[PDB]
Design a protein around this ligand. Structure first.
Ligand SMILES: CC(=O)N1Cc2c(-c3ccc(C(=O)N4CCCc5ccccc54)cc3)cnn2C[C@@H]1Cc1ccccc1
Ligand SMILES: [Zn+2]
Ligand SMILES: [Zn+2]
Ligand SMILES: [Zn+2]
Ligand SMILES: [Zn+2]
Ligand SMILES: [Zn+2]
Ligand SMILES: [Zn+2]
Lengths: 72, 235, 73
């Protein structure tokens, strides 16, 4: 499935993820597309800062929903 | 939890919903919430809850909540209305109308918290609307009470009446605008086909349906008898 | 988003609005299209008068939902 990450500038990127992907996977997949080291990657979904140890499903991240990225 | 929304988009029906939050100033989804909401008022009343927007140059603090249909992907601004009276039948209460145990259900805000399934709630609204037995309240709108006749049980969020379906829902909006002007102290233009909502002055018996082109029909009539203005009395 | 303002007579107006737009903005948007002074405009949704200070989101007005318009003298 695909999910969307919207950046602060507004440009919306598209990732292929699986629900078991951890948030780590997602940050790697984001730097692959846009080159931002995960160290500067803060992801927000539903008013919660997204934690490295958990998986997309842990947060009920469903197919074709949107994460927002904020840098450090 | 399990929320329910009316999805007027693809589903055209009541569906489980997502609860989402944006910053109240930059209308973006970067606000971190201090604590989860714990009751409907937290998400229904504005500025009931506070957080920190993570947009670099935004000081937003106010949580603005909204819901989406949960039955399929949605664009982040394709919203649906939360039907806050609808909930899962966790305690498995039989319908007060068909006495069948069903899920989800609508729970009226009357003292007994009476339960009705959506099919029966549908039938309630339609017949009450055909009969013109919806009730108008100047603070609340065109609504209905608990079916069992309980007091102080007028549904507050009027989007629950989306259960009427699209055609009956639009008729409901029209009847309610008709009852609104009448409650306002106005009168409905009697000319068949016109039906403007008129707001003449209080003393004025000579009402002229003249808003302009396509607005009024031009008829001049008598509030009391509803005929073209006479100077005598209504026989 | 789009919303519709309907009269009881049937006349339909079509507006571009944002959910944060206040009822006062809506009434200005109407006078831009129709020449009706906002003072003469009464807006109704689901049988409730809309208050000039509150927003479309305050009444949970959805995209392509319909408001009713009535005129005052
Ligand atoms: C953005 C937001 O708020 N959330 C919360 C929330 C709920 C939820 C539902 C019920 C409850 C609940 O416990 N109650 C109490 C009883 C019924 C009720 C009715 C309305 C509201 C809350 C409740 C709590 C919460 C369901 N999804 N998300 C998504 C998102 C996740 C989150 C973000 C940031 C901080 C904490 C959590
Ligand atoms: Zn839907
Ligand atoms: Zn903000
Ligand atoms: Zn029933
Ligand atoms: Zn009751
Ligand atoms: Zn007329
Ligand atoms: Zn008369």
């Amino acid at each position: 499935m695909q999910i969307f990450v919207k950046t602060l500038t507004g440009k919306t990127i598209t990732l292929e993820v699986e629900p078991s992907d951890t948030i780590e996977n997602v940050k790697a997949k984001i730097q692959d597309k846009e080159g931002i080291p995960p160290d500067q990657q803060r992801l927000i979904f539903a008013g919660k800062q997204l934690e490295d140890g958990r998986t997309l499903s842990d947060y009920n991240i469903q197919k074709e929903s949107t994460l927002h990225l904020v840098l450090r | 939890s399990s929320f329910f929304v009316y999805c007027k988009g693809p589903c055209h029906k009541v569906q489980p919903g997502k609860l989402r939050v944006q910053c109240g100033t930059c209308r973006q989804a970067t606000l971190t919430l201090a604590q989860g909401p714990s009751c409907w008022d937290d998400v229904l009343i504005p500025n009931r809850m506070s957080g920190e927007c993570q947009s670099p140059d935004c000081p937003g603090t106010r949580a603005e909540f909204f819901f989406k249909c949960g039955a399929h992907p949605t664009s982040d601004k394709d919203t649906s209305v939360a039907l806050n009276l609808i909930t899962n039948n966790s305690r498995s209460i039989p319908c007060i109308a068909c006495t069948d145990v069903r899920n989800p259900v609508l729970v009226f805000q009357c003292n007994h918290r009476h339960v009705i399934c959506l099919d029966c709630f549908h039938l309630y609204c339609v017949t009450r609307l055909n009969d013109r037995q919806f009730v108008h309240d100047a603070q609340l709108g065109y609504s209905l009470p608990c079916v069992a006749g309980c007091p102080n049980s007028l549904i507050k969020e009027l989007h629950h009446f989306r259960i009427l379906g699209e055609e009956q829902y639009n008729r409901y909006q029209q009847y309610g605008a008709e009852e609104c002007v009448l409650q306002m102290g106005g009168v409905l233009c009697p000319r068949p086909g016109c039906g403007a909502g008129l707001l003449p002055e209080q003393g004025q018996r000579k009402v002229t349906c003249e808003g302009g082109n396509g607005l009024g029909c031009g008829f001049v009539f008598c509030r009391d008898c509803k005929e073209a203005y006479h100077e005598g009395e209504c026989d």
